[PDB]
Write an enzyme that holds these catalytic residues in place. Structure first.
Site, PDB file in Angstrom:
ATOM      1  N   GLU A  35      77.578  40.369  33.229  1.00  0.00           N
ATOM      2  CA  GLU A  35      77.148  39.801  31.959  1.00  0.00           C
ATOM      3  C   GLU A  35      78.220  39.985  30.861  1.00  0.00           C
ATOM      4  O   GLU A  35      78.471  39.046  30.101  1.00  0.00           O
ATOM      5  CB  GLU A  35      75.841  40.428  31.517  1.00  0.00           C
ATOM      6  CG  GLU A  35      74.609  40.040  32.327  1.00  0.00           C
ATOM      7  CD  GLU A  35      74.224  38.603  32.235  1.00  0.00           C
ATOM      8  OE1 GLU A  35      74.821  37.831  31.442  1.00  0.00           O
ATOM      9  OE2 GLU A  35      73.273  38.212  32.953  1.00  0.00           O
ATOM     10  N   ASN A  46      74.703  29.918  24.380  1.00  0.00           N
ATOM     11  CA  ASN A  46      74.019  29.222  25.426  1.00  0.00           C
ATOM     12  C   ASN A  46      73.933  27.721  25.059  1.00  0.00           C
ATOM     13  O   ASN A  46      73.984  27.336  23.899  1.00  0.00           O
ATOM     14  CB  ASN A  46      72.601  29.808  25.574  1.00  0.00           C
ATOM     15  CG  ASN A  46      72.635  31.264  25.940  1.00  0.00           C
ATOM     16  OD1 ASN A  46      73.443  31.686  26.781  1.00  0.00           O
ATOM     17  ND2 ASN A  46      71.802  32.062  25.296  1.00  0.00           N
ATOM     18  N   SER A  50      70.928  29.006  21.525  1.00  0.00           N
ATOM     19  CA  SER A  50      70.765  30.453  21.374  1.00  0.00           C
ATOM     20  C   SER A  50      72.103  31.137  21.737  1.00  0.00           C
ATOM     21  O   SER A  50      73.036  30.479  22.213  1.00  0.00           O
ATOM     22  CB  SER A  50      69.646  30.951  22.269  1.00  0.00           C
ATOM     23  OG  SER A  50      69.951  30.780  23.623  1.00  0.00           O
ATOM     24  N   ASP A  52      73.734  34.970  23.544  1.00  0.00           N
ATOM     25  CA  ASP A  52      73.499  36.215  24.253  1.00  0.00           C
ATOM     26  C   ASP A  52      74.386  37.313  23.662  1.00  0.00           C
ATOM     27  O   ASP A  52      75.558  37.081  23.368  1.00  0.00           O
ATOM     28  CB  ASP A  52      73.870  36.066  25.725  1.00  0.00           C
ATOM     29  CG  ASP A  52      72.898  35.233  26.506  1.00  0.00           C
ATOM     30  OD1 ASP A  52      71.805  34.890  26.033  1.00  0.00           O
ATOM     31  OD2 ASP A  52      73.243  34.921  27.700  1.00  0.00           O
ATOM     32  N   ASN A  59      69.279  37.446  24.960  1.00  0.00           N
ATOM     33  CA  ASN A  59      69.345  36.239  24.175  1.00  0.00           C
ATOM     34  C   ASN A  59      68.500  36.262  22.912  1.00  0.00           C
ATOM     35  O   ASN A  59      67.504  36.968  22.728  1.00  0.00           O
ATOM     36  CB  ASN A  59      68.985  34.979  24.986  1.00  0.00           C
ATOM     37  CG  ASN A  59      67.476  34.854  25.230  1.00  0.00           C
ATOM     38  OD1 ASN A  59      66.707  34.574  24.300  1.00  0.00           O
ATOM     39  ND2 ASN A  59      67.045  35.070  26.481  1.00  0.00           N
ATOM     40  N   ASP A 101      58.645  41.442  31.784  1.00  0.00           N
ATOM     41  CA  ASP A 101      57.995  40.193  31.348  1.00  0.00           C
ATOM     42  C   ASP A 101      57.459  39.326  32.498  1.00  0.00           C
ATOM     43  O   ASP A 101      56.926  38.241  32.264  1.00  0.00           O
ATOM     44  CB  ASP A 101      58.911  39.413  30.383  1.00  0.00           C
ATOM     45  CG  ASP A 101      59.993  38.614  31.091  1.00  0.00           C
ATOM     46  OD1 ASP A 101      60.948  38.186  30.390  1.00  0.00           O
ATOM     47  OD2 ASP A 101      59.927  38.433  32.325  1.00  0.00           O
TER      48      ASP A 101
END
Ligand SMILES: [Cl-]
Ligand SMILES: [Cl-]
Ligand SMILES: [Cl-]
Ligand SMILES: [Cl-]
Ligand SMILES: [Cl-]
Ligand SMILES: [Cl-]
Ligand SMILES: [Cl-]
Ligand SMILES: [Cl-]
Ligand SMILES: [Cl-]
Ligand SMILES: [Cl-]
Ligand code: NA
EC number: 3.2.1.17
Length: 129
Positions: A35, A46, A50, A52, A59, A101
Site C-alpha cells: 500500500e 483514487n 477520494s 488514500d 480512504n 466491516d
C-alpha cells in the site's frame, strides 16, 4: 516516516494488530508494504475522487475527512492528515474498524491481490518481536 520492516511489525504488534480479526501480523506488514512502502506520508488519489492516506492507504470515501471528498463519510472520526503521522495509532485504530466491516482484509485490494494466500509470515522473518 518511512518505517523499517521489523520496526513497523513491532509497532503494529504493540497496537494489537497481530491476529486482529484473525489476521496474523505478516498480513498487516505485507499490506503496508504494497500500500505505502511503509511510508506514513503516502497519499494517492483514487479514480472516484477520494484519496488514500498513510501506511495502510485508508480512504477518504468512508473513513476519514479530507474536506474534498463530496458525498463521502468519516467513520473513523479523524482528519485524513492524522493518518500521515509518524505515530501509527490513528491508522491502526481506523484499520481495526475497516477490517471489522464484513469483508475482512479484502477491504484492501492490494492485500487481496498481493498478500492473500501467500507466505505472509515471510514479512516478519528475523524480527525480534
Ligand atoms: Cl504472520
Ligand atoms: Cl510494488
Ligand atoms: Cl504523499
Ligand atoms: Cl480526496
Ligand atoms: Cl493508513
Ligand atoms: Cl485539491
Ligand atoms: Cl469531504
Ligand atoms: Cl459530503
Ligand atoms: Cl501513521
Ligand atoms: Cl475474515
Ligand atoms: Na470522507
Amino acid at each position: 516516516k518511512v518505517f523499517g520492516r521489523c520496526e513497523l511489525a513491532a509497532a503494529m504488534k504493540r497496537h494489537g494488530l497481530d491476529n486482529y480479526r484473525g489476521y496474523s501480523l505478516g498480513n498487516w506488514v505485507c499490506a503496508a508494504k504494497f500500500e505505502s512502502n511503509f511510508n506514513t506520508q503516502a497519499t494517492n488519489r483514487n479514480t472516484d475522487g477520494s484519496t488514500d492516506y498513510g501506511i495502510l492507504q485508508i480512504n477518504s470515501r468512508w473513513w476519514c475527512n479530507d474536506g474534498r471528498t463530496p458525498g463521502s463519510r468519516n467513520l473513523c472520526n479523524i482528519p485524513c492528515s492524522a493518518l500521515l503521522s509518524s505515530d501509527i495509532t490513528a491508522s491502526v485504530n481506523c484499520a481495526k474498524k475497516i477490517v471489522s466491516d464484513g469483508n475482512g482484509m479484502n477491504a484492501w485490494v492490494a492485500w487481496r491481490n498481493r498478500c492473500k494466500g501467500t507466505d505472509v509470515q515471510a514479512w516478519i522473518r528475523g524480527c525480534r518481536l
